[PDB]
Amino acid sequence: KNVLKIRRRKMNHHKYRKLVKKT
Amino acid sequence: YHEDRIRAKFYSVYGSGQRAFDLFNPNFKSTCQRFVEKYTELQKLGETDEEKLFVETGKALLAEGVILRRVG
Amino acid sequence: PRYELALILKAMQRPETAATLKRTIEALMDRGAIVRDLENLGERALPYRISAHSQQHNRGGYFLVDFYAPTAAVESMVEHLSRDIDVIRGNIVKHPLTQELKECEGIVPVPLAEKLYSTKKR
Amino acid sequence: REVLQLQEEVKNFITRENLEARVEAALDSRKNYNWAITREGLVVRPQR
Amino acid sequence: AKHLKFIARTVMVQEGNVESAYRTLNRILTMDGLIEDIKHRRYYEKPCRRRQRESYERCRRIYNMEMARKINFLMRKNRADPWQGC
Amino acid sequence: DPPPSTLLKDYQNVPGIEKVDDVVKRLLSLEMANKKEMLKIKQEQFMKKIVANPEDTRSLEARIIALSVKIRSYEEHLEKHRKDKAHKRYLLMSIDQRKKMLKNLRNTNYDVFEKICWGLGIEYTFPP
Amino acid sequence: ATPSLRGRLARFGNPRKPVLKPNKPLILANRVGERRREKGEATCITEMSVMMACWKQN
Amino acid sequence: TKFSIYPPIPGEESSLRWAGKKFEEIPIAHIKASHNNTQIQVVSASNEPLAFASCGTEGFRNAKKGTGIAAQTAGIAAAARAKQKGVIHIRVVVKGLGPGRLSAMHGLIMGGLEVISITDNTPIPHXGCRPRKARKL
Amino acid sequence: RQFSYLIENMARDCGEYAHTRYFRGGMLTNARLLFGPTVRLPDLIIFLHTLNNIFEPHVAVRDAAKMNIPTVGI
Amino acid sequence: SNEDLPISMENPYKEPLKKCILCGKHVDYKNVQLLSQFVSPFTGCIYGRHITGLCGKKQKEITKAIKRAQIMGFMPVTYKDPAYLKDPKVCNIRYRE
RNA sequence: AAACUCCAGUUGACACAAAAUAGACUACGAAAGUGGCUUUAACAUAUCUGAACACACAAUAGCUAAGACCCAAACUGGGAUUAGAUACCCCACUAUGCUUAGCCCUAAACCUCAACAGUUAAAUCAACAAAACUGCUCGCCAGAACACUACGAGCCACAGCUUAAAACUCAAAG
Ligand code: FES
Ligand SMILES: [K+]
Ligand SMILES: [K+]
Ligand SMILES: [K+]
Ligand SMILES: [Mg+2]
Ligand SMILES: [Mg+2]
Ligand SMILES: [Mg+2]
Ligand SMILES: [Mg+2]
Ligand SMILES: [Mg+2]
Ligand SMILES: [Mg+2]
Numbered sequence A: 001k002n003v004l005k006i007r008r009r010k011m012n013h014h015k016y017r018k019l020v021k022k023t
Numbered sequence B: 001y002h003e004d005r006i007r008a009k010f011y012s013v014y015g016s017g018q019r020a021f022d023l024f025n026p027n028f029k030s031t032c033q034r035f036v037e038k039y040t041e042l043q044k045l046g047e048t049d050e051e052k053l054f055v056e057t058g059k060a061l062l063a064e065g066v067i068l069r070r071v072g
Numbered sequence C: 001p002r003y004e005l006a007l008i009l010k011a012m013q014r015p016e017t018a019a020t021l022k023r024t025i026e027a028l029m030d031r032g033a034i035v036r037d038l039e040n041l042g043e044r045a046l047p048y049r050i051s052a053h054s055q056q057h058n059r060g061g062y063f064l065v066d067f068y069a070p071t072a073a074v075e076s077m078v079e080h081l082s083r084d085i086d087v088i089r090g091n092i093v094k095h096p097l098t099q100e101l102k103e104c105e106g107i108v109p110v111p112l113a114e115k116l117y118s119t120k121k122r
Numbered sequence D: 001r002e003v004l005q006l007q008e009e010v011k012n013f014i015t016r017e018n019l020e021a022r023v024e025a026a027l028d029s030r031k032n033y034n035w036a037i038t039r040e041g042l043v044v045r046p047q048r
Numbered sequence E: 001a002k003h004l005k006f007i008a009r010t011v012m013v014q015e016g017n018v019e020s021a022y023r024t025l026n027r028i029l030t031m032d033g034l035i036e037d038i039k040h041r042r043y044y045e046k047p048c049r050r051r052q053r054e055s056y057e058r059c060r061r062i063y064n065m066e067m068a069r070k071i072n073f074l075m076r077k078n079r080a081d082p083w084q085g086c
Numbered sequence F: 001d002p003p004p005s006t007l008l009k010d011y012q013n014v015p016g017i018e019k020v021d022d023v024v025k026r027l028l029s030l031e032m033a034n035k036k037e038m039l040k041i042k043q044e045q046f047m048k049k050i051v052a053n054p055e056d057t058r059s060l061e062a063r064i065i066a067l068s069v070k071i072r073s074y075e076e077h078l079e080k081h082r083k084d085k086a087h088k089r090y091l092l093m094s095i096d097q098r099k100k101m102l103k104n105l106r107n108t109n110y111d112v113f114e115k116i117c118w119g120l121g122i123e124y125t126f127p128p
Numbered sequence G: 001a002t003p004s005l006r007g008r009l010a011r012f013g014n015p016r017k018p019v020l021k022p023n024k025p026l027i028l029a030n031r032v033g034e035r036r037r038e039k040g041e042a043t044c045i046t047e048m049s050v051m052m053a054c055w056k057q058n
Numbered sequence H: 001t002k003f004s005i006y007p008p009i010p011g012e013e014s015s016l017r018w019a020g021k022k023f024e025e026i027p028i029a030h031i032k033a034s035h036n037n038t039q040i041q042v043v044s045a046s047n048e049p050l051a052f053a054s055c056g057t058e059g060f061r062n063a064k065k066g067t068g069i070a071a072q073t074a075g076i077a078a079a080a081r082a083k084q085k086g087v088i089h090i091r092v093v094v095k096g097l098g099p100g101r102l103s104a105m106h107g108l109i110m111g112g113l114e115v116i117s118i119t120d121n122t123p124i125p126h127x128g129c130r131p132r133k134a135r136k137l
Numbered sequence I: 001r002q003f004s005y006l007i008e009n010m011a012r013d014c015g016e017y018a019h020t021r022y023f024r025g026g027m028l029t030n031a032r033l034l035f036g037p038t039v040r041l042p043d044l045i046i047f048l049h050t051l052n053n054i055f056e057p058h059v060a061v062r063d064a065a066k067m068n069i070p071t072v073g074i
Numbered sequence J: 001s002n003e004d005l006p007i008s009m010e011n012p013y014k015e016p017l018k019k020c021i022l023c024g025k026h027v028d029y030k031n032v033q034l035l036s037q038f039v040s041p042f043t044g045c046i047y048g049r050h051i052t053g054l055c056g057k058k059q060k061e062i063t064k065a066i067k068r069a070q071i072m073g074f075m076p077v078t079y080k081d082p083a084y085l086k087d088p089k090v091c092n093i094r095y096r097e
Numbered sequence K: 001a002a003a004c005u006c007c008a009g010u011u012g013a014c015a016c017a018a019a020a021u022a023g024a025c026u027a028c029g030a031a032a033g034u035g036g037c038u039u040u041a042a043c044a045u046a047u048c049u050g051a052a053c054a055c056a057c058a059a060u061a062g063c064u065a066a067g068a069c070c071c072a073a074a075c076u077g078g079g080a081u082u083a084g085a086u087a088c089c090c091c092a093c094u095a096u097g098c099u100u101a102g103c104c105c106u107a108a109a110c111c112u113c114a115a116c117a118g119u120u121a122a123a124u125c126a127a128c129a130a131a132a133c134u135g136c137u138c139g140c141c142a143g144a145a146c147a148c149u150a151c152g153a154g155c156c157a158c159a160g161c162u163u164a165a166a167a168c169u170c171a172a173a174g
């Protein structure tokens, strides 16, 4: 199977951690 | 078959004799079969032990002129 | 239970080797050991250079002590041997002969594993 | 049978009385545990 | 460091035949696994990558040892065609 | 705890062991044996004191006694090895198993359940 | 003898963790791999070296 | 007698002699074959330096030291300096799997030294220090 | 192929037919195209060996059943 | 009925199970002569069972005895003791070819 | 290239680090994990099933405090590459990996295949994968995305973890 579902979740978590750090 | 027990011991003690099996002849009798037939005959007498009965069979064949060279 | 002390002693003259063996056997007895036998395996060249007690040893006297001791004695005896300057190396093992050799009938052959993959056409 | 064998074996155990004598006897003797196996499974003890 | 020197991995030259001696030594090191161990020890193989290689090396042996057993089993049938024409 | 001079359970009934040499007696005693050999004697003492038939090892009573001896051995092991997580699990599981055995005995034979609790000093507690 | 395959693969019967994790199913194909071409090496470096060294000397 | 690949044991008595010298007395040629350099030091049997030559000391620079030809040149240089000090027979001890592992010995032979043995001392840790991380190439 | 010659003689002697050679695809199920529209197919097919030379069922066993031809087979 | 029908037995011709050369013998760590027969003469590496031909039980016993002898000051680690180089060769390995 | 030249090679002395070969073995443990040697203790249950939360555990990373330090090494600095190179390659060195005492409680913690008891005959069977099913029990799942998110609650956790939605949008997602 491809990892396209993981990739969406990967970006969501990345952007969330950056937001929490910024604020 | 019952005689396979005898055949197995004969082949272990003596091995396949130099006499070659002729499987084309439907009535060929190998040295092992001759032993089986004699051993089976002595069993009818009433001997109930293998060791003694086995030893007695070899002696009968030696009297008849069969060559029984043991592996030893 | 029964143990075996594999004692590699420093290569010394007979009077000193006899004192060390007496010293060692008395230490076992002082800790509750019943010493069964003492075997001399002979003086040999050590397999490798062993540095013990600020000395480099190239030869040693191999001795075996067969003794029965309480389980708590083993830890104590190991400490005593660490401080003896005439002992190059001392190891206490459970005697090899307490373990009875199990009876083996021979090698049981194992066939090629089967039905690992389906029999469908690929 | 095990207790009986042990009672016979306990006679030849090293004690504080015979320790010195048993040490001297050990220093004289040699016990070799070395032996080699062959391809036929026969033990070849050392000849020394 | 502690062991005696000039006993391990030492090979004597016969009649100044250095080539044959070096080939012999290299074959001893290969057949024991030293040459392949040295090359793998240059960089750290992480534990997960080492298990993946061992599994790969083990599955290849099995396949390679079973193919060879079939090749030697069928080599008998490389003889000339006995029924040439049918 | 059984005195260290207590003879092993195997040699306690061999005829004439009271007359053997002192050295032989201490070689066949608990002092010269591992910890598991002393636990077999503890089990026998509890079995004789509590169980009606000390030779029936398959009754719910004998099984509670045997497990209680193991529980005590785990408690002593953990007093020295306080960070042994594997044995702490074995202790907690063994305690839960004995509670299930005691619940079954209480439900079936109340007269013997009281003798188990008295002999082994177990206080039965109803679950929350 | 070929290494055993009993309990080596992750199968329903197998209780233990898999020993082997083959990427391809372990089933003999009907072909063998081609003969590999020997990787070329530069020849006559020693003889080249002696000629070039003498050139330097002379 | 049949040729024994196994070296003569120092303690036991052997008949094998090289110019009247026993195996324990022959000078040793220590070759360190690295991935980028080859270093050859010829020492006496009593650990007294006699000759040293590396690919660096022979004028090869940077990536040109890690070549067979460069190691061979170092071998010849070490042999020349060793032969001046009286070395004929040498026991080669090579450690490392670099490009100049074999070439270095050819250089030593081309220089007039006779190799009576070939030992490998490549360091192999039995479990040791964790090596550097794998390169991403 | 050890018995191809024997079998082909036996067929000729009894006035019957033998096909001991490589069985080309469609000999039975595509006969009208291969032989001709008015070709008459066999009424009985006797398999003296039912396996081909890769130890699998001879294709004609399946094709005879498709064409409703009874088959005798060793 | 008939007397010639096959009877039910266990294969009377069955051969005895093969036994490793060390089947039934005590492997002691002190017996370094025996243990040396299963290590490489050049590297001291312990040979695998495909070379030694030992059963799984004896391969473990030999391995554990070697590791004990080596750390207890009985056996060298990096080479085979030269004294034991002439013992009977029992390992199926060819180094010179 | 930088770096080093207080350097390198040989020899001797020399760890609070990591454990060739064996292992082509396939074992131990509930799982996580466990492969140098020795000794001590020691691997629950005589029906099975039974919890995100009770109870006890749980790789790596990380936190708190005290130690050890060979080597490795986030970060950082230098060299090089490049249009740029906050990377890939080279060098150096730190947190960290280790020990002791408490935390934290996550993983592609996946053999993505639940525990127990059976079966190989029928329809064997969407496809692929690691053949298809029966009894019984517990857990869990009901279009995609929003969402390993918001709010509430609990927690030694305070840029955390566990539990976990909706509005708007789409006719697909898979
Ligand atoms: S086959 Fe019996 S121990 Fe090896
Ligand atoms: K190790
Ligand atoms: K959880
Ligand atoms: K997985
Ligand atoms: Mg998103
Ligand atoms: Mg895949
Ligand atoms: Mg520079
Ligand atoms: Mg349960
Ligand atoms: Mg619930
Ligand atoms: Mg954790």
Ligand SMILES: [Mg+2]
Pocket: none
């Ligand atoms: Mg930490």
Ligand SMILES: [Mg+2]
Pocket: K071
């Ligand atoms: Mg460093």
Ligand SMILES: [Mg+2]
Pocket: none
């Ligand atoms: Mg640090």
Ligand SMILES: [Mg+2]
Pocket: none
């Ligand atoms: Mg895992």
Ligand SMILES: [Mg+2]
Pocket: K114, K115, K138
């Ligand atoms: Mg369940």
Ligand SMILES: [Mg+2]
Pocket: none
């Ligand atoms: Mg089942």
Ligand SMILES: [Mg+2]
Pocket: K148
């Ligand atoms: Mg998460």
Ligand SMILES: [Mg+2]
Pocket: none
């Ligand atoms: Mg959250």
Ligand SMILES: [Mg+2]
Pocket: K151, K152
């Ligand atoms: Mg809410």
Ligand SMILES: [Mg+2]
Pocket: none
């Ligand atoms: Mg909140």
